[PDB]
Design an enzyme around this catalytic site. Structure first.
Site, mmCIF file in Angstrom:
data_model
loop_
_atom_site.group_PDB
_atom_site.id
_atom_site.type_symbol
_atom_site.label_atom_id
_atom_site.label_comp_id
_atom_site.label_asym_id
_atom_site.label_seq_id
_atom_site.Cartn_x
_atom_site.Cartn_y
_atom_site.Cartn_z
ATOM 1 N N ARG D 13 0.792 -1.218 0.000
ATOM 2 C CA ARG D 13 0.000 0.000 0.000
ATOM 3 C C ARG D 13 0.838 1.288 0.000
ATOM 4 O O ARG D 13 1.749 1.458 -0.817
ATOM 5 C CB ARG D 13 -1.032 -0.045 1.143
ATOM 6 C CG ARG D 13 -2.053 -1.183 0.943
ATOM 7 C CD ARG D 13 -2.605 -1.763 2.251
ATOM 8 N NE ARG D 13 -3.463 -0.811 2.974
ATOM 9 C CZ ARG D 13 -4.750 -0.574 2.700
ATOM 10 N NH1 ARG D 13 -5.365 -1.204 1.706
ATOM 11 N NH2 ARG D 13 -5.427 0.310 3.427
ATOM 12 N N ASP D 142 -3.156 11.978 10.121
ATOM 13 C CA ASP D 142 -4.528 11.730 9.722
ATOM 14 C C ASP D 142 -5.280 13.060 9.534
ATOM 15 O O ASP D 142 -5.416 13.833 10.472
ATOM 16 C CB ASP D 142 -5.168 10.844 10.792
ATOM 17 C CG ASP D 142 -6.581 10.425 10.461
ATOM 18 O OD1 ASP D 142 -7.110 10.788 9.387
ATOM 19 O OD2 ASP D 142 -7.156 9.714 11.305
ATOM 20 N N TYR D 155 -6.693 4.396 18.352
ATOM 21 C CA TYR D 155 -6.082 4.756 17.079
ATOM 22 C C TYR D 155 -6.041 6.269 16.901
ATOM 23 O O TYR D 155 -5.024 6.827 16.469
ATOM 24 C CB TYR D 155 -6.810 4.111 15.892
ATOM 25 C CG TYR D 155 -6.318 4.625 14.556
ATOM 26 C CD1 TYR D 155 -5.244 4.021 13.915
ATOM 27 C CD2 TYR D 155 -6.917 5.724 13.961
ATOM 28 C CE1 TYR D 155 -4.788 4.493 12.686
ATOM 29 C CE2 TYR D 155 -6.471 6.213 12.747
ATOM 30 C CZ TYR D 155 -5.410 5.595 12.116
ATOM 31 O OH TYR D 155 -4.961 6.093 10.904
HETATM 32 N N1 LIG Z 1 -7.334 5.594 4.158
HETATM 33 C C1 LIG Z 1 -6.042 5.490 4.446
HETATM 34 O O1 LIG Z 1 -5.245 4.464 3.897
HETATM 35 C C2 LIG Z 1 -5.418 6.450 5.425
HETATM 36 C C3 LIG Z 1 -6.142 7.534 5.958
HETATM 37 C C4 LIG Z 1 -5.579 8.328 6.959
HETATM 38 C C5 LIG Z 1 -4.292 8.026 7.416
HETATM 39 N N2 LIG Z 1 -3.583 6.958 6.898
HETATM 40 C C6 LIG Z 1 -2.207 6.683 7.408
HETATM 41 O O2 LIG Z 1 -1.294 6.580 6.324
HETATM 42 C C7 LIG Z 1 -0.341 5.536 6.537
HETATM 43 C C8 LIG Z 1 -0.406 4.480 5.423
HETATM 44 O O3 LIG Z 1 -1.705 3.919 5.312
HETATM 45 P P1 LIG Z 1 -1.952 2.379 4.870
HETATM 46 O O4 LIG Z 1 -3.408 2.146 4.698
HETATM 47 O O5 LIG Z 1 -0.961 1.992 3.814
HETATM 48 O O6 LIG Z 1 -1.519 1.592 6.194
HETATM 49 P P2 LIG Z 1 -1.747 0.040 6.530
HETATM 50 O O7 LIG Z 1 -1.723 -0.748 5.276
HETATM 51 O O8 LIG Z 1 -3.041 -0.159 7.231
HETATM 52 O O9 LIG Z 1 -0.486 -0.287 7.489
HETATM 53 C C9 LIG Z 1 0.829 0.070 7.120
HETATM 54 C C10 LIG Z 1 1.808 -1.037 7.491
HETATM 55 O O10 LIG Z 1 2.165 -0.915 8.851
HETATM 56 C C11 LIG Z 1 2.600 -2.183 9.307
HETATM 57 N N3 LIG Z 1 2.251 -2.557 10.681
HETATM 58 C C12 LIG Z 1 1.013 -2.762 11.243
HETATM 59 N N4 LIG Z 1 1.206 -3.146 12.533
HETATM 60 C C13 LIG Z 1 2.535 -3.210 12.776
HETATM 61 C C14 LIG Z 1 3.277 -3.559 13.902
HETATM 62 N N5 LIG Z 1 2.661 -3.914 15.026
HETATM 63 N N6 LIG Z 1 4.658 -3.534 13.827
HETATM 64 C C15 LIG Z 1 5.299 -3.172 12.657
HETATM 65 N N7 LIG Z 1 4.558 -2.831 11.544
HETATM 66 C C16 LIG Z 1 3.202 -2.859 11.612
HETATM 67 C C17 LIG Z 1 1.997 -3.267 8.415
HETATM 68 O O11 LIG Z 1 3.114 -4.005 7.963
HETATM 69 P P3 LIG Z 1 3.118 -5.517 7.426
HETATM 70 O O12 LIG Z 1 2.088 -5.652 6.312
HETATM 71 O O13 LIG Z 1 4.521 -5.805 6.950
HETATM 72 O O14 LIG Z 1 2.686 -6.475 8.517
HETATM 73 C C18 LIG Z 1 1.275 -2.466 7.332
HETATM 74 O O15 LIG Z 1 1.509 -2.982 6.036
HETATM 75 C C19 LIG Z 1 -0.644 4.929 7.901
HETATM 76 O O16 LIG Z 1 0.214 5.479 8.877
HETATM 77 C C20 LIG Z 1 -2.076 5.360 8.166
HETATM 78 O O17 LIG Z 1 -2.369 5.411 9.557
HETATM 79 C C21 LIG Z 1 -4.138 6.176 5.909
HETATM 80 N N1 LIG Z 2 -8.701 9.256 7.929
HETATM 81 C C1 LIG Z 2 -9.286 8.295 8.661
HETATM 82 N N2 LIG Z 2 -9.084 8.128 9.966
HETATM 83 C C2 LIG Z 2 -9.831 7.090 10.367
HETATM 84 C C3 LIG Z 2 -10.005 6.496 11.631
HETATM 85 C C4 LIG Z 2 -10.851 5.400 11.777
HETATM 86 C C5 LIG Z 2 -11.536 4.898 10.662
HETATM 87 C C6 LIG Z 2 -11.389 5.474 9.388
HETATM 88 C C7 LIG Z 2 -12.096 4.945 8.278
HETATM 89 C C8 LIG Z 2 -11.419 4.224 7.284
HETATM 90 C C9 LIG Z 2 -12.088 3.708 6.170
HETATM 91 C C10 LIG Z 2 -13.458 3.916 6.026
HETATM 92 C C11 LIG Z 2 -14.147 4.637 7.009
HETATM 93 C C12 LIG Z 2 -13.477 5.148 8.130
HETATM 94 C C13 LIG Z 2 -10.523 6.585 9.251
HETATM 95 N N3 LIG Z 2 -10.139 7.353 8.222
HETATM 96 C C14 LIG Z 2 -10.639 7.235 6.838
HETATM 97 C C15 LIG Z 2 -11.989 8.002 6.764
HETATM 98 C C16 LIG Z 2 -12.552 8.675 7.860
HETATM 99 C C17 LIG Z 2 -13.769 9.369 7.776
HETATM 100 C C18 LIG Z 2 -14.449 9.385 6.560
HETATM 101 CL CL1 LIG Z 2 -15.965 10.218 6.337
HETATM 102 C C19 LIG Z 2 -13.888 8.716 5.478
HETATM 103 CL CL2 LIG Z 2 -14.699 8.770 3.974
HETATM 104 C C20 LIG Z 2 -12.685 8.032 5.564
#
Ligand SMILES: NC(=O)c1ccc[n+]([C@@H]2O[C@H](COP(=O)([O-])OP(=O)(O)OC[C@H]3O[C@@H](n4cnc5c(N)ncnc54)[C@H](OP(=O)(O)O)[C@@H]3O)[C@@H](O)[C@H]2O)c1
Ligand SMILES: Nc1nc2cccc(-c3ccccc3)c2n1Cc1ccc(Cl)c(Cl)c1
Ligand SMILES: NC(=O)c1ccc[n+]([C@@H]2O[C@H](COP(=O)([O-])OP(=O)(O)OC[C@H]3O[C@@H](n4cnc5c(N)ncnc54)[C@H](OP(=O)(O)O)[C@@H]3O)[C@@H](O)[C@H]2O)c1
Ligand SMILES: NC(=O)c1ccc[n+]([C@@H]2O[C@H](COP(=O)([O-])OP(=O)(O)OC[C@H]3O[C@@H](n4cnc5c(N)ncnc54)[C@H](OP(=O)(O)O)[C@@H]3O)[C@@H](O)[C@H]2O)c1
Ligand SMILES: Nc1nc2cccc(-c3ccccc3)c2n1Cc1ccc(Cl)c(Cl)c1
Ligand SMILES: Nc1nc2cccc(-c3ccccc3)c2n1Cc1ccc(Cl)c(Cl)c1
Ligand SMILES: Nc1nc2cccc(-c3ccccc3)c2n1Cc1ccc(Cl)c(Cl)c1
Ligand SMILES: [Cl-]
Ligand SMILES: [Cl-]
Lengths: 249, 249, 248, 249
Positions: D13, D142, D155
């Site tokens: 990802r 986030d 979280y």
């Molecule tokens: N919608 C979104 O995707 C979104 C929205 C807001 C913020 N973010 C932030 O953006 C970043 C990337 O998102 P993402 O969806 O790519 O993240 P993710 O796939 O949910 O997790 C990222 C990686 O972190 C590793 N991880 C989980 N638990 C761990 C542990 N206990 N020790 C070491 N590594 C661990 C996992 O590694 P392994 O697979 O190798 O086990 C996973 O592949 C994250 O920091 C996330 O919180 C994402």
């Molecule tokens: N940025 C972010 N922080 C989150 C914390 C807990 C859950 C979610 C989440 C992730 C995927 C779908 C819905 C909520 C979180 N997300 C993604 C998110 C949060 C709110 C909204 Cl309305 C959407 Cl469309 C996506």
């Protein structure tokens, strides 16, 4: 001697609730109004029969214009004229309607939504401070300023400018012992023209009780901010929104 | 063809650097000016000597009036007239001076500090969107918006307003694919009005290198926001402040 | 019957003032402490002289561990055993010291600065909610976005407490449990801190050029738990004399 | 000599798209993983085929424990062992799952959500700095941190702590010329487990295009922050959320 307060747009709704609650605490009040002459006079009559000579009205349009400074100076002057002092200013008066980016002219919309929401509050603050013990100013802000409604940019701009005024005046007026704070509703009394079915759609979005704030609930927060219980508080904007601002799309 | 950009207050300092950098990236540019005709024409000459017929000048006095809507319409029009398109608007023009709460008339102070800082950017935004690929608007915000300088309330209010505009317009114009973002400098080019002993007192406060941002560091952030590298980015305000806003009293 | 409040770190300073003001408002109070047994006890005694059987003490270390959940469950339980109800939780207890990025082990610094400041509040909030004008008040930091040099773990804890305040406000709202914060700027300064250093910090305060009394912080807490704040949740009230508004 | 980057949770990802783009930009990369062994080794191979000796993997569990500091020191050590240097740290790894207030113990939930999301970033930052040009750290924050999802308190707490770290380290590491910044996604790649109707419900909330961010769009913002075009930027968190955080309930 009893303290005195100016409340702008105090004839009805949230403005009236604040003036009533101030008066109930022992304030003499200036009930500023624009078009709501009937409502304002009747409030004043009401409060004056509770305690004689403790409520006056004051008419002024708060649209931005070259004579807005005069009008704002006059509002404050009316409080000194009536009561020989002015302790509290509540900036409540607000024009509110959409101005889509893509009726009235744009120059009028800027003048009304920026004037009443931000410029008059700034001018009133100037006159309040220049005319000068628990002195303070409370601005009616918006809990939702950073999650704005579609097509409301000028209104949102004015409310954002109001936050900057709150913070700038708190900083600048603190040496004179004037506190400046804000009360930020999310949804409180809905617009008069709104249908019930539309009102409920909006209410259901409030996490705390799925209802709008009562005018009293907003007023309670203004009362706290002016009281001796908030003597060290300046530059703070208290949301009174039942958690609305924390709710994602 | 090449995309076209409007930069307000583009004759000097930060606006110049933005116009120069947009042009180096391949934009055709409108150099807006109010007073600085000679300097704006001088820039256009240097840009045209680089690539023929890629830079034009536009005169408009951005002080809030009944004619500010016309001036703003004109600026957007001049881009479409010169280049047949307008891809980018940079709301950079800025008035800046104190307005103590306790010289110019306050009507003029409001015209300039709210007029040119916030109302012109609103009217420019309206006209930009009305006239409509990678379309975006970038607003010159203030990283110190929430820690205002003493006696700068009207300046601060207009910059607060600008944040509201950025966020409101981002939301409302997204359906058109128009992105709306901000760049918020900390300390920039320190006033030649100021001395040097004073200038360093302000400089030493910046955590990252105890120096001000160059105009080009600011422009880099604008370039990013308008690029294909920021196509999911809207409603964001990037601070370019070297850590300044994070420093406590 | 009178409502009941739990105040963490209630033996001295801000915690003591809050417990006192709650008691003066008509609350029965659980006085939590860690090491200040004498102060916690003499506070309980003074309050019980005022109104009999209205104050108890409860010892617990709020550092992060495998037993923290039980300790926090026991703090909440003690309020129920003492008083048969628990209407107010004030998360006040706080470890506070610098943790430079460049003689407690670092894992102890994490345990204490994050456990007591953020994790213990979360676990208390959980136990409080499972056990049910109910509200929670967390003691946040007005300066949370203008951090002091070398206080990263402290700053992380206080930022996490904002998260908790807003997340729990949302999640507990359907139970009519409000969750708010009070954020001081400078309040009671270390009594050991030199007066001349004390004055460097006070002078930065726009409103009055002085730190907040414990009582002024308590006044904000009193407002938030009262009937005057029944539509208020997820809100963080600064009590900082304008400090957070002052640029470098 | 080529610069070197550590990306945590880089097997899949967003972390993977960040590693790929750093590599395409000229960086040598440490690809950290916890469980995704095959994917991590598979990425390093792809990267090494492109430019030999430019990618390595490093396994570590980033859950909070009394050995977490040793593991974080080791991740940083691995970069120095492979490349002789470490210029960039991306804190991307994240545990994500609900922890309701009313199969894991609460101990493990705290250890994972706070450990991975906040403590491990702290300890990597510590080790990074201690081991010490254009040095910087990017934290994956986030955009929705002030608009939490129901039952995600721990979280959300970790993500909040991450903001404090970002700002605290920016101030503290500035005299060493290390910049500390954040990229804040709204919705990007949605959970694997999630069904398609649910996916489109969340997708529909995003004003810019009614779609989630690509992994590459997140990486672009990280590339900007580590680049020479961000040299005066520290303590800044750039949202890459298509306007999501601006939408009211
Ligand atoms: N919608 C979104 O995707 C979104 C929205 C807001 C913020 N973010 C932030 O953006 C970043 C990337 O998102 P993402 O969806 O790519 O993240 P993710 O796939 O949910 O997790 C990222 C990686 O972190 C590793 N991880 C989980 N638990 C761990 C542990 N206990 N020790 C070491 N590594 C661990 C996992 O590694 P392994 O697979 O190798 O086990 C996973 O592949 C994250 O920091 C996330 O919180 C994402
Ligand atoms: N940025 C972010 N922080 C989150 C914390 C807990 C859950 C979610 C989440 C992730 C995927 C779908 C819905 C909520 C979180 N997300 C993604 C998110 C949060 C709110 C909204 Cl309305 C959407 Cl469309 C996506
Ligand atoms: N109600 C809510 O859900 C809510 C939500 C967010 C923020 N707020 C803020 O809270 C405050 C009170 O809310 P509300 O709903 O009670 O307000 P409101 O009814 O919309 O306005 C209060 C008064 O503003 C005065 N006003 C309008 N235009 C004016 C002008 N040009 N010059 C002078 N006065 C003018 C009117 O006085 P006259 O009747 O005398 O003409 C009106 O009665 C406002 O500042 C509002 O923006 C309210
Ligand atoms: N004073 C200020 O300028 C200011 C500014 C910003 C924020 N605040 C916040 O306001 C609140 C109260 O401030 P304060 O200055 O009065 O606090 P404080 O005196 O520094 O600490 C209060 C109590 O917290 C308890 N505590 C510390 N570590 C503990 C642990 N590991 N386990 C259980 N309890 C522990 C201690 O209890 P025992 O004594 O019984 O051992 C201590 O007396 C705190 O949350 C603080 O962070 C204060
Ligand atoms: N606080 C605020 N600022 C506004 C700006 C423009 C319109 C409204 C509004 C007013 C009534 C009903 C819906 C939106 C505004 N409101 C009230 C409001 C905003 C968003 C939401 Cl979701 C709700 Cl229930 C109420
Ligand atoms: N960003 C910003 N907004 C301002 C509003 C009024 C005055 C200044 C300012 C400008 C130059 C020197 C000092 C203050 C303003 N600045 C620049 C500034 C603000 C605070 C600090 Cl501590 C610094 Cl060194 C520069
Ligand atoms: N609110 C707050 N959070 C802090 C985190 C670490 C240290 C302090 C602190 C405490 C006492 C004196 C100076 C800094 C902290 N304070 C108190 C404080 C912070 C900044 C300033 Cl300018 C002041 Cl007069 C007091
Ligand atoms: Cl009414
Ligand atoms: Cl101009």
């Amino acid at each position: 001697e009893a303290p005195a307060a100016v409340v702008t747009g105090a004839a009805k709704r949230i403005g009236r609730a604040i003036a009533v609650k101030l008066h109930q605490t022992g304030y003499r009040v200036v009930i500023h109004y624009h078009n709501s002459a009937e409502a304002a006079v009747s409030l004043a009559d009401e409060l004056n029969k509770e305690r004689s000579n403790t409520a006056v009205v004051c008419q002024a349009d708060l649209t931005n214009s070259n004579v807005l400074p005069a009008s704002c100076e006059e509002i404050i002057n009316s409080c000194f004229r009536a009561f020989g002092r002015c302790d509290v200013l509540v900036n409540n008066a607000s024009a509110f309607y959409p101005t889509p980016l893509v009726g009235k002219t744009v120059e009028t919309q800027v003048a009304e939504l920026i004037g009443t929401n931000a410029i008059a509050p700034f001018l009133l603050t100037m006159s309040f401070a220049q005319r000068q013990s628990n002195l303070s100013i409370v601005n009616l802000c918006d809990a939702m300023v950073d999650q704005p409604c579609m097509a409301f940019s000028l209104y949102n701009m004015g409310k954002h400018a109001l936050v900057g005024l709150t913070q700038s005046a708190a900083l600048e007026l603190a040496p004179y012992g004037i506190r400046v704070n804000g009360v930020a509703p999310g949804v409180s009394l809905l617009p008069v023209a709104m249908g019930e079915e539309e009102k409920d759609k909006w209410r259901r979005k409030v996490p705390l009780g799925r209802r709008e704030a009562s005018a009293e609930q907003i007023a309670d927060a203004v009362i706290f901010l002016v009281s001796g219980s908030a003597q060290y508080i300046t530059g703070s904007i208290i949301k009174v929104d039942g958690g609305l601002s924390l709710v994602h799309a």
